[PDB]
Amino acid sequence: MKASPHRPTKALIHLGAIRQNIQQMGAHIPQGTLKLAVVKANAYGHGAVAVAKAIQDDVDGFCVSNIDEAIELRQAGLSKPILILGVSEIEAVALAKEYDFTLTVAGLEWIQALLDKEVDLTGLTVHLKIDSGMGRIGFREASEVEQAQDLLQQHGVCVEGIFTHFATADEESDDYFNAQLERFKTILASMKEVPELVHASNSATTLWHVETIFNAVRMGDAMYGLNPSGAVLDLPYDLIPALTLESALVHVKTVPAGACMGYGATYQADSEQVIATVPIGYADGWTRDMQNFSVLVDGQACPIVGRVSMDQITIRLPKLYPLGTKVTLIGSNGDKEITATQVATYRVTINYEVVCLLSDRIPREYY
Amino acid sequence: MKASPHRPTKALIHLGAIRQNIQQMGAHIPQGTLKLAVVKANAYGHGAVAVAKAIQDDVDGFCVSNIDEAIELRQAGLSKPILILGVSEIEAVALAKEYDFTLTVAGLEWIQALLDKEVDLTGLTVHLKIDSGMGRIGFREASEVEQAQDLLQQHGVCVEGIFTHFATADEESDDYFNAQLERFKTILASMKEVPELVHASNSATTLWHVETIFNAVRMGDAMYGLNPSGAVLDLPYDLIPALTLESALVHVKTVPAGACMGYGATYQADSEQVIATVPIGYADGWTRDMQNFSVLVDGQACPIVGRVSMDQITIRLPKLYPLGTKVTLIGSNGDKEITATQVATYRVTINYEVVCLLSDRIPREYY
Numbered sequence: 001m002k003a004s005p006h007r008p009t010k011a012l013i014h015l016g017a018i019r020q021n022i023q024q025m026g027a028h029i030p031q032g033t034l035k036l037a038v039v040k041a042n043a044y045g046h047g048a049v050a051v052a053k054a055i056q057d058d059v060d061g062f063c064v065s066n067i068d069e070a071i072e073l074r075q076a077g078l079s080k081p082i083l084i085l086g087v088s089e090i091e092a093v094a095l096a097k098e099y100d101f102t103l104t105v106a107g108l109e110w111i112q113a114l115l116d117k118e119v120d121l122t123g124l125t126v127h128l129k130i131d132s133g134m135g136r137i138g139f140r141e142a143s144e145v146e147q148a149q150d151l152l153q154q155h156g157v158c159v160e161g162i163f164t165h166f167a168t169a170d171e172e173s174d175d176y177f178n179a180q181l182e183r184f185k186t187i188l189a190s191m192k193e194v195p196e197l198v199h200a201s202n203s204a205t206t207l208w209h210v211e212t213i214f215n216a217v218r219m220g221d222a223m224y225g226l227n228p229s230g231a232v233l234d235l236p237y238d239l240i241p242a243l244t245l246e247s248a249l250v251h252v253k254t255v256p257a258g259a260c261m262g263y264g265a266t267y268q269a270d271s272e273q274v275i276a277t278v279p280i281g282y283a284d285g286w287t288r289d290m291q292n293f294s295v296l297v298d299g300q301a302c303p304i305v306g307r308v309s310m311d312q313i314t315i316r317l318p319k320l321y322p323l324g325t326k327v328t329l330i331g332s333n334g335d336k337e338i339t340a341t342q343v344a345t346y347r348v349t350i351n352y353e354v355v356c357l358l359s360d361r362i363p364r365e366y367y
Numbered sequence: 368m369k370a371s372p373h374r375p376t377k378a379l380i381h382l383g384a385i386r387q388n389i390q391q392m393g394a395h396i397p398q399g400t401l402k403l404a405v406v407k408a409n410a411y412g413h414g415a416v417a418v419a420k421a422i423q424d425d426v427d428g429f430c431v432s433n434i435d436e437a438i439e440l441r442q443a444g445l446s447k448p449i450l451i452l453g454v455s456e457i458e459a460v461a462l463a464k465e466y467d468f469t470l471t472v473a474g475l476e477w478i479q480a481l482l483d484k485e486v487d488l489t490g491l492t493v494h495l496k497i498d499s500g501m502g503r504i505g506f507r508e509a510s511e512v513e514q515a516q517d518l519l520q521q522h523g524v525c526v527e528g529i530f531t532h533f534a535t536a537d538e539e540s541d542d543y544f545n546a547q548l549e550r551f552k553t554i555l556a557s558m559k560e561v562p563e564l565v566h567a568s569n570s571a572t573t574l575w576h577v578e579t580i581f582n583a584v585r586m587g588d589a590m591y592g593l594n595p596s597g598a599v600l601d602l603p604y605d606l607i608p609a610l611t612l613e614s615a616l617v618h619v620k621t622v623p624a625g626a627c628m629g630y631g632a633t634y635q636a637d638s639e640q641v642i643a644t645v646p647i648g649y650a651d652g653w654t655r656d657m658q659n660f661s662v663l664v665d666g667q668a669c670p671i672v673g674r675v676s677m678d679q680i681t682i683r684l685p686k687l688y689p690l691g692t693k694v695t696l697i698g699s700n701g702d703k704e705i706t707a708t709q710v711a712t713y714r715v716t717i718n719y720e721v722v723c724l725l726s727d728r729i730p731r732e733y734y
Contacts, residue, residue: 001409001727004435006459041650041677041728042368065678066646068371085644086678087617092373107618109690135628135673136681137618137644167632176632250454251474251504261502265534265543277504279433279453283408283723288716306502310408310719311432311453314503323476351656352677356650360368360406360727 001283001361008248008324009280011364013046015054017179017240021223022058024237025206034216035225036083036199039073040065045355046243047364049076049320053214054366055223056080063218067092070101083127083161085218087137090114091156097123102160104129106137108148115155125132126152127161128195132184134167142190149193161197162188163218169204170229177205181212207236226351230341241339244331245362248324251277251299252317261314262306266291274317276302277286278327281311285357286329295327299334302327368650368728369492374617375691376647378731379698380413382421384607388592389425391604392573392584401583403566404590406440407432408453411591412722412730413610416443423447430585434459437468450494450528454504457481457613461567469527471496472522473504478518489523495562497531497554500547505531516560528564531557536571537596543654544572548579560583571595574603586656593718597708608706610722612729618644619684628681629673633658641684643669645694648678652724653696661711662694666701669694697721 026035037059043051052062052073061081064070067089070082083102090113096103096213105111106129113308114121128145139145145162152159164184168176181200188194198214203222205212223227226239255275261267269275280286288308294301295315302315315327330338340351347354393402404426410418419429419440428448431437434456438450450469455621457480464487472478473496481488495512496505504510516526529552535543548567555561565581570589572579588595589717592608626636635684636642645662647653655675661668662682682694693700697707707718714721 001412002415002439003434004433004462006434006456006462008456038592044677045650066371066374068373072369087538087644089375095373107620107690109619113690131620133627133632134630135622135626135642136510136679140620140622167627167630170633176627207417250456250477252476253498253507259502260500260534260543263501263534264538265500265502275502277454282720283412283432285724287724288720297457306471309503310411312503323474323480344700353649353655356677357652357654357724357726359724 001358003363004361005363007279009362010246011358011362013364013366014242017225017242017365018051018057018223019055021225021239025219025222026298028210029213029217033213034060036061036216036218037061038063038218040069041356044352045358046109046152046224048072050366052078067095067101068153071099074099090117093124104128108144110152111148122156124157125160125164126157128159128188130162130164130184132164133180134165142187145187146191158354159195161328163199166202166205168198169209199243221352227341230350231345241356246331247278247280248274249321249327250279252282252321255361264307267306274320275314276317278313278315279311281309281313283310283359284361285359293346295329296333296336296338297325297327299336368726369726370730372730374646376651376729377613378725378729379611379734380731381609384592385418385422385590388590388606389422392586392589395604396573396577396580396584400580401427402470403428403430403585405430405584405585405587407436408723411719412725413591415439417733419445434463440467443692457484461486472515475515478515491524492527493519493524493623494528494530497551499531499550501532501534509554512554513558526562529562530566533569533572536569536576570634572640575600576645588719594708597711597717612696613698614645614647614694616643616688617646617690619687619690631674634673641687643679643683643684645682648677648680650677650726651728652726656714663692663703663705664688664692665699666703
């Protein structure tokens with residue numbers, strides 16, 4: 001989808017909030033700890049380039065999900081280290097050396113495919129991924145790690161770091177987290193040589209298991225001011241939500257009792273009422289399950305009535321308003337606020353998904 | 368999100384399927400009927416520019432949701448008429464006039480605001496929207512419409528068309544559909560001068576209510592080979608889905624009973640089994656509610672086990688397969704097929720939203 005600047009629907013991104021969030025996390029981790037800003041998925045829908053430029057001088061490096069996301073940052077002028085967190089294609093070892101990226105290595109088969117293809121590996125920097133119980137990617141046994149470490153170093157790869165990832169750091173129970181931490185430590189303890197940069201901590205590990213931090217933290221959701229646990233756990237200190245989502249009224253009508261709104265005619269006015277149309281819909285990532293959720297107009301909750309269309313929603317207003325009146329979908333308006341977490345809860349999902357699905361059709365504006 | 372060509376996740380768009388679907392619709396409507404290709408929301412996530420260029424010679428116009436989508440078509444050299452379906456901003460009308468876009472006009476308040484800005488509207492082409500029971504945008508009263516048509520003509524605006532839209536053309540029951548149709552016809556009958564180009568028919572109306580077609584059809588879902596009713600109604604003739612979604616294995620392991628996958632550790636292997644990782648996740652629009660749905664690998668259904676991550680899913684394979692083995696998420700694979708309708712039903716949504724949410728991180732390739 002192409003950014004639509006001539007439509008009044010927009011996402012506002014408070015870059016200072018992101019900076020402040022990084023500061024508050026910094027104030028609460030040990031002194032030498034490296035801060036890696038996770039800006040995968042276009043900085044969780046906030047804008048990877050604009051966010052990276054705003055905060056570069058405050059972090060030690062970036063993390064992205066794939067090499068194309070890293071390339072995007074390099075082309076824009078970002079100069080700090082970038083770690084690609086997932087598996088890369090064989091056809092991208094050469095690029096890492098040319099753009100100066102660090103790659104994650106997670107399995108023997110992958111290394112053996114790279115060796116078979118006979119690519120030169122000499123300049124390459126990598127981190128080894130350990131699967132300590134997330135079951136997603138990484139070496140699962142100590143012997144596998146060392147065999148991989150031996151084989152990489154001998155083809156001249158620099159094995160710089162080693163990391164794992166936690167599945168349950170954002171839950172009340174700490175049993176699964178503890179089991180993973182111990183697995184990871186035992187695997188590190190059995191290596192004859194441990195890579196110099198060891199890291200395991202996502203946002204939730206940083207916020208609730210601060211005493212378990214290794215040499216770096218990978219800051220995601222918290223950087224954007226989002227509670228990684230959603231509504232489950234209280235933050236140990238305040239985070240400011242970076243992203244706000246707004247639009248305006250483009251049609252306002254009074255309808256008599258009996259009038260139906262939307263596909264399926266699933267909503268029927270029981271009395272005379274004011275119905276307004278707002279130019280956002282599911283192609284913008286305001287999904288169909290937002291029906292009956294409220295937006296804010298002039299400090300008041302207005303329900304989305306009838307089905308969400310591809311490009312438009314109809315809402316019920318408490319009275320007549322002019323064309324162009326501001327609609328707040330995420331953010332504050334009057335004395336009321338809607339958070340991305342509140343949106344995720346309504347949809348039965350997590351705030352990560354809400355912000356990522358905000359489509360590129362909505363322009364991002366920065367302040 | 369930026370297209371990631373160095374990752375093996377891609378959407379294949381068969382332009383020949385789209386061509387055949389338009390031809391198929393043409394064969395089942397009167398020979399004189401104009402066909403307008405609806406390519407809002409980046410052609411429902413299929414690629415508005417590439418789809419528009421592929422089919423331009425076979426259609427009489429394009430429909431988009433806003434001026435910026437219209438500009439994107441023009442800047443790529445499309446020359447056919449472009450109708451903007453939703454309300455346009457007042458500040459954007461001068462730009463629209465320079466590009467010869469056809470704008471939708473839906474309310475008197477809007478027209479008044481436009482005239483208050485003293486911008487020259489001479490030669491602007493518009494269509495009037497009639498709300499006949501969609502309750503979204505458009506004139507609801509016969510006299511509202513003629514006041515509008517009069518005000519516009521007095522300022523040199525050319526009123527070329529008039530349209531309405533149906534809320535329930537894709538349902539078994541025809542009651543609401545018929546009331547809308549009669550309301551529309553009653554409106555048109557009450558005007559002293561009906562604009563030349565009358566249209567009302569979306570995909571569902573075109574498919575299931577052929578006898579109701581006016582001068583033109585607006586082809587949406589059916590053009591992409593998608594059943595507008597999902598699984599509710601049988602198609603009157605064959606449609607070929609245009610979009611296939613595929614990826615590849617990037618990690619493969621065998622885990623014993625007891626091993627857990629994904630965030631929250633919500634899936635625990637109850638037997639030794641093969642688990643592979645595929646680089647697609649909810650930031651690509653493969654949403655978290657896809658957990659426990661299956662993808663296809665080597666003609667076999669393989670469930671998504673554990674939570675969907677932002678960039679990755681883990682699936683259970685029936686035996687070992689090498690890295691790079693193709694995964695089909697939407698499309699055919701061996702003797703099996705997964706449709707966007709099946710995906711939609713699983714999520715409790717409609718196929719429109721499935722394809723619209725496939726983010727731009729997925730490159731489109733055109734066949």
